């Protein structure tokens, strides 16, 4: 009779003249991502930003604006926030720059310097961001270590709302979908719920614990549903104690309602984060230390007025 409550999120249209120092950061199936500085006019601030483009066409602009709709409607420290959009021939999305990139690249590049505390804290933070999306009735549908960004080694956020839907279940209609992160009911019946996102969370945690191994490496996507139906799962990572591996296996149960809830994953990983060497066995753990605020990436002329997007709020 009333469906859902009104979505009073604000969508900010940002002037192209407010952006300086645009440089390409990287490209892929997600499109092209640039870095830059957003200098809102009449305000003495310089905000480091990332700008995404689907690498002009009508269908591309509709898809980027659905992602803008979802991201403008989310406000959580562990979820990427849309700062606004820029209306060039192709619509661009503006968000906070995450200078350490994605967690998939990060764990591969720094695998010898990552301790148990960081890994278990990232699990807590990803579960917090996903629990927030569940409170907002959003099913992400593309949770993976490539879609978790690193603001600092101590603070990660979930990104890429290209497949996200506002749901008891959601039913997809074709398109390319990442099979190796999907729950079995999603591969077979296109059923997507917060509990199918829990399965993707399990795979994401396995990616972190294996320092960026490819799930089911060398196995074609077409053979994954058969492997899962036979009861096969991703193997126990060498650093994982049975306590951590059991949590991953619970995420991959056939019965979606038997899987943990994101709020329970926050609790379990938070208890483990209090004594991280009891739960992850890493050769040379806790001597290693990754960077923290307490910004070389910035040019000297910008340093004084630089403000991170997390400290730039608007009424
Ligand atoms: C991931 C690597 C990775 O993402 N990299 C490494 C090279 C630079 C690039 C492409 C980046 C970035 C970046 C930086 N700051 C903030 C956001 C992003 C950004 N990266 C990705 C995003 C995404 O949506 N999909 C996946 C890659 C992402 N998001 C952005 C960017 C701009 C605006 C918006 Cl609103 C936003 O989020 C929607 C490793 N993978 C290649 C495996
Ligand atoms: Cl993929
Ligand atoms: Cl890869």
From Swiss-Prot:
Effect of residue 55 to P: Found in a lung cancer sample
PTM per Swiss-Prot/TrEMBL: Phosphorylated on Tyr residues in response to EGF. Dephosphorylation by PTPRJ prevents endocytosis and stabilizes the receptor at the plasma membrane. Dephosphorylated by PTPN1 and PTPN2. Monoubiquitinated and polyubiquitinated upon EGF stimulation; which does not affect tyrosine kinase activity or signaling capacity but may play a role in lysosomal targeting. Polyubiquitin linkage is mainly through 'Lys-63', but linkage through 'Lys-48', 'Lys-11' and 'Lys-29' also occurs. Deubiquitination by OTUD7B prevents degradation. Ubiquitinated by RNF115 and RNF126. Ubiquitinated by ZNRF1 or CBL at different lysines in response to EGF stimulation; leading to recruitment of the ESCRT machinery and subsequent degradation in the lysosomes.
Residues where ATP binds: 25-33, 52, 95-96, 160
Tissue expression per record: Ubiquitously expressed. Isoform 2 is also expressed in ovarian cancers.
Effect upon mutating residue 95 to M: Found in a lung cancer sample; increased kinase activity
Effect of residue 26 to C: Found in a lung cancer sample
Mutagenesis / variant outcome for changing residue 275 to A: Strongly reduced phosphorylation
Outcome of swapping residue 73 to I: Found in a lung cancer sample; constitutively activated kinase with higher levels of basal autophosphorylation; more sensitive to gefitinib than wild-type
Residue list for modification Phosphoserine: 292
Cross-link named Glycyl lysine isopeptide (Lys-Gly) (interchain with G-Cter in ubiquitin), sites: 23, 44, 59, 62, 168, 230, 261, 271
Reported effect, residue 26 to D: Found in a lung cancer sample
Name of the molecule in the record: Epidermal growth factor receptor
Ranges for domain Protein kinase: 19-280
Compartment list: Cell membrane; Endoplasmic reticulum membrane; Golgi apparatus membrane; Nucleus membrane
Outcome (variant: residue 92 to R): Found in a lung cancer sample
Effect recorded for residue 16 to A: Found in a lung cancer sample; more sensitive to gefitinib than wild-type
Residue positions where N6-(2-hydroxyisobutyryl)lysine is found in the record: 52
Site feature (Important for interaction with PIK3C2B) residues: 312
Subunit structure, interactors included: Binding of the ligand triggers homo- and/or heterodimerization of the receptor triggering its autophosphorylation. Heterodimer with ERBB2. Forms a complex with CCDC88A/GIV (via SH2-like regions) and GNAI3 which leads to enhanced EGFR signaling and triggering of cell migration; binding to CCDC88A requires autophosphorylation of the EGFR C-terminal region, and ligand stimulation is required for recruitment of GNAI3 to the complex. Interacts with ERRFI1; inhibits dimerization of the kinase domain and autophosphorylation. Part of a complex with ERBB2 and either PIK3C2A or PIK3C2B.
Effect of residue 163 to R: Found in a lung cancer sample; somatic mutation; constitutively activated enzyme with strongly increased kinase activity; more sensitive to gefitinib than wild-type
Resulting phenotype, residue 12 to A: Abolishes phosphorylation
Annotated phenotype, changing residue 41 to K: Found in a lung cancer sample
Family to which this protein belongs: Belongs to the protein kinase superfamily. Tyr protein kinase family. EGF receptor subfamily.
Active site: 142
Encoding gene, per UniProt annotation: EGFR
Function (record text): Receptor tyrosine kinase binding ligands of the EGF family and activating several signaling cascades to convert extracellular cues into appropriate cellular responses. Known ligands include EGF, TGFA/TGF-alpha, AREG, epigen/EPGN, BTC/betacellulin, epiregulin/EREG and HBEGF/heparin-binding EGF. Ligand binding triggers receptor homo- and/or heterodimerization and autophosphorylation on key cytoplasmic residues. The phosphorylated receptor recruits adapter proteins like GRB2 which in turn activates complex downstream signaling cascades. Isoform 2 may act as an antagonist of EGF action.
